[PDB]
Every structure is written in C-alpha cells, then in structure tokens.
Write an enzyme that holds these catalytic residues in place. Sequence first.
Site, short mmCIF file in Angstrom:
data_model
loop_
_atom_site.label_atom_id
_atom_site.label_comp_id
_atom_site.label_asym_id
_atom_site.label_seq_id
_atom_site.Cartn_x
_atom_site.Cartn_y
_atom_site.Cartn_z
CG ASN A 32 -2.19 0.79 1.08
OD1 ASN A 32 -2.64 1.01 0.00
ND2 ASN A 32 -2.75 1.22 2.20
CG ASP A 97 2.90 -2.60 3.27
OD1 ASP A 97 3.03 -2.29 4.48
OD2 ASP A 97 1.84 -2.42 2.61
CD1 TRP A 98 -1.07 -3.89 3.58
CD2 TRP A 98 -1.73 -5.98 4.06
NE1 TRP A 98 -1.79 -3.85 4.75
CE2 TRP A 98 -2.23 -5.11 5.06
CE3 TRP A 98 -2.04 -7.35 4.15
CZ2 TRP A 98 -2.97 -5.57 6.14
CZ3 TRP A 98 -2.78 -7.80 5.23
CH2 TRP A 98 -3.25 -6.91 6.21
CD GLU A 121 9.89 -1.33 6.96
OE1 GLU A 121 8.74 -0.89 7.14
OE2 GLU A 121 10.77 -1.29 7.84
CG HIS A 265 6.99 1.13 4.54
ND1 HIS A 265 6.91 -0.08 5.20
CD2 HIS A 265 6.11 1.05 3.51
CE1 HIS A 265 6.02 -0.85 4.60
NE2 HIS A 265 5.52 -0.19 3.57
#
Length: 292
Positions: A32, A97-98, A121, A265
Amino acid sequence: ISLHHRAVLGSTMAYRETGRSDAPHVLFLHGNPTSSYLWRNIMPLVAPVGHCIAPDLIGYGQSGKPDISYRFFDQADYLDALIDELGIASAYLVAHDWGTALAFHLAARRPQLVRGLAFMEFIRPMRDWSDFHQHDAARETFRKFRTPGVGEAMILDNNAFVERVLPGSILRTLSEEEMAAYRAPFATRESRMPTLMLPRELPIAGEPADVTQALTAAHAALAASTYPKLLFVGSPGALVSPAFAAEFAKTLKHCAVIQLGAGGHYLQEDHPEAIGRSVAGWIAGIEAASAQ
Ligand SMILES: [Cl-]
Ligand SMILES: [Cl-]
Ligand SMILES: [Cl-]
C-alpha cells in the site's frame, strides 16, 4: 508505461515482465499504496537471472477497479488467479508490506511453490498498538485510519495514504513525474477505497480476527519452512527496525539479513541498486547450489 494485462475473476490485472523466459520465475509483490512501479529500478538488475513478473494488485496501478471489498482475502484471491493464469508453479518471491502478507499466506497454502523469499518491511500480527511502527505520530495516524468516518475523510477525501504516508517514508524527494505516477490510479474518491481497506486489515490486538488467524498461521509456517530467505532492513525502518530484523531472523531457518542503511518503509526508492544486486546474486547462488 505499457504493461501486460490478463482477465482475472471477471476483472483484469496488469503486470510488468522482464528477463529470460527460461530462467526461474521471480514474483515481485508490492504493498500500500504502490504498484509494480515500485520495482522499476530493481527488476532490470534481476532480469539476467530470473523471469521477473511484478503484478499490480487488484485496485492498484493499471489493474482493474471492480466493485469488491478489497480486503486481504480479496487481494489473495486475485493474486492466486493471476499466478495460475500465468502458469507460475515455482518461483522466488520478492515482497514488501502487504506483499509480504500475501507471500507468507501463499507459501503456507502452496508450500511447493517457493524457491526462496526475499522480503522487507513485513507485516506480522501485533499484540498491541505499541508493536506497530517506530513512533507515536505514525501510530496515531493509523489509529485514525482505522476509526469509522475519520479514516474515510483522511483517505477517501484527502488521499492521505498516497499524498502523506508514501512520501513521508521515502528519504529522497520523488520527482514530479514519480509522484504523478504514484497518484495516477487514485484520481477519484472511490478509487481510493483499497488504500483505506488495507490499514483496517492490519492485525492489531487480534482485530480483524480472520486476518489475524491467516497471518498467525502463515508466520508459523514461515518459521517451519526450509527455503532460503533474505531479509532487507533499513535504519530506522518503519515496520521493521534493525534490532527487530536481527531478532526475527533468529526465529527462522536459512534467513540472512542485509543492512541497507538509512531508510524508512519504501526502501526500494532509497536503495534500488542494493536490493536488485543482492537479489540477483542470491538467486544465482541458490540456483547453482541446488543444481549440484
Ligand atoms: Cl513453473
Ligand atoms: Cl496477536
Ligand atoms: Cl549496489
């Protein structure tokens, strides 16, 4: 930027593709609110050793915008459908991330698929809000995203994930062209729904319970798995500090930590060459050591 497209589950998904078609598949998974664009300076460095595929998740990038919930399990379903459409049965995964939650969940359900996992991350179940991120300002922003009405005003009306969270966790300043590309899929209010759903899916204090179960199981499967792993970390990082990366690595088998230096990130925007060169060398080593 002309991408490939395939019809998937009554909508469409886009993906970048590069590298020799007889090299092992390498699947790059964004989070995201990015897209395959996040990998644009990394994939060319992996192309000599891998057949690289970087999808845009459903509702992101140049993929379709169907009328769906955009929950984690929706993202998993559309990614599975694209993987099967493209004939990917064995692959290295490179995830952020996701994208890491998708990679862990995929590896748990298809334990024969993964040749190796390169990740950074990453998402894991967080027992308390105090386990999310490195500073209170980020925790408060995400608490607000998860608050009914408030989150809609910040993300749907103000596009805060694209316009604040994204540049706020890149050390360099993106060019006008780069930021224009990142916001382009999100020009309308309704198009921003996927970017609001994902912070509401983060497993914090057991909520939502279904995502918590899926990622608790996926993390246990990851701890038991034997495939090679490469964890990149930045300083101070965002979801993963250097200290947490070293400690998390001890819970896994066959996982090396690569320190990238200063970053938050979106490490791909601050260290693309280091990530691409590391991943390509790592694949070359695994392929050579596994070919006897
Ligand atoms: Cl295959
Ligand atoms: Cl938990
Ligand atoms: Cl480098």
